[PDB]
Design a protein around this ligand. Structure first.
Ligand SMILES: CS(=O)(=O)c1cccc2c(-c3nc(N[C@H]4CCCNC4)ncc3C(F)(F)F)c[nH]c12
Length: 278
């Protein structure tokens, strides 16, 4: 069939959706990442739309193959991801110029996506792919144990209708993690995740987040924790970085900085594109 054209090299992982292989296209010679999804006409169209969402900081969707109760997604292959790179840089830390470069590129990717009203919905270090050229790319565009660490509070509080702000939240959480070498909000249940957020950022109220007390899963019985200083949260990040990060972690989605506006932030005045040691 269609899949005879792909020579499996190795299983590279497995997710909620399905299994990912490193594979070789026998006709093009291309090395690819191949996702097998076990099985809808709406997914076929919504995924096919991702084939046109092409940007240098988005992993390239080469092919959508719907054959025989199975959907295969053929993607560009990259050798490393940010979770593994973070782990390999634990003793030393990712140098700030590279953190900055990565954050900048990811915001370009988001800006592009968000300009087309496409949300990612599920940014996490594992799905941010890096190469030897200094590039970082968004992968695994979510459609609409699964990690909760990068989930925006409006999602946790039961907002049915996400805005692009959910991605900015997630990227802020990733930025802080690259800086501190520890996850910002490592929740192990939805309530633990929400309360970890509250313990750092203050339990939100109508002052800081108009509408919060009407949200579907908002409970008046939530404990009232006070906000901590950001200088406590992400030392030794500089004032530009902390200012940007605070704007990316605003509780209210409508106050949260956009990707486009983040790209103009003074934090990026001295941005460069270093090459990492992989
Ligand atoms: C989170 S999961 O279960 O969905 C999953 C499992 C395994 C690989 C992937 C990838 C992926 N991985 C690579 N490379 C791997 C190489 C090994 C070090 N991590 C990166 N290259 C391209 C992709 C592509 F986005 F195109 F699908 C995306 N999601 C994955």
């Amino acid at each position: 069939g269609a899949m005879e054209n792909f020579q499996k090299v190795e299983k590279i992982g497995e997710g909620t959706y399905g299994v990912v292989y490193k594979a070789r296209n026998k006709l093009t010679g291309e090395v690819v990442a191949l996702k097998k999804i076990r099985l809808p006409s709406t997914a076929i169209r919504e995924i096919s739309l991702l084939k046109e969402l092409n940007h240098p900081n988005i992993v390239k969707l080469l092919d959508v193959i719907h054959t025989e109760n199975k959907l295969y997604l053929v993607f560009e292959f990259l050798h490393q991801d940010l979770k593994k790179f973070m782990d390999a840089s634990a003793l030393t830390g990712i140098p700030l110029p590279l953190i900055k470069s990565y954050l900048f590129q990811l915001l370009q990717g988001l800006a592009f996506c968000h300009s087309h009203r496409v949300l990612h919905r599920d940014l996490k270090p594992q799905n941010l792919l890096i190469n030897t050229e200094g590039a970082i790319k968004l992968a695994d565009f979510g459609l609409a144990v699964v990690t909760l660490w990068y989930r925006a509070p409006e999602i946790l509080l039961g907002c049915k209708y996400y805005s692009t702000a959910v991605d900015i939240w997630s990227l802020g959480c990733i930025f802080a993690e690259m800086v501190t070498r520890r996850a910002l909000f490592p929740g192990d249940s939805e309530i633990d995740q929400l309360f970890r957020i509250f313990r750092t950022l203050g339990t939100p109220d109508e002052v800081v987040w108009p509408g919060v007390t009407s949200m579907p899963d908002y409970k008046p019985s939530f404990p009232k924790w006070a906000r901590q200083d950001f200088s406590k949260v992400v030392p030794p990040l500089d004032e530009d970085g902390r200012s940007l990060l605070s704007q990316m972690l605003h509780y209210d989605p409508n106050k949260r900085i956009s990707a486009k506006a983040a790209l103009a932030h003074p934090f990026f005045q001295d941005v460069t594109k270093p090459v990492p040691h992989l």
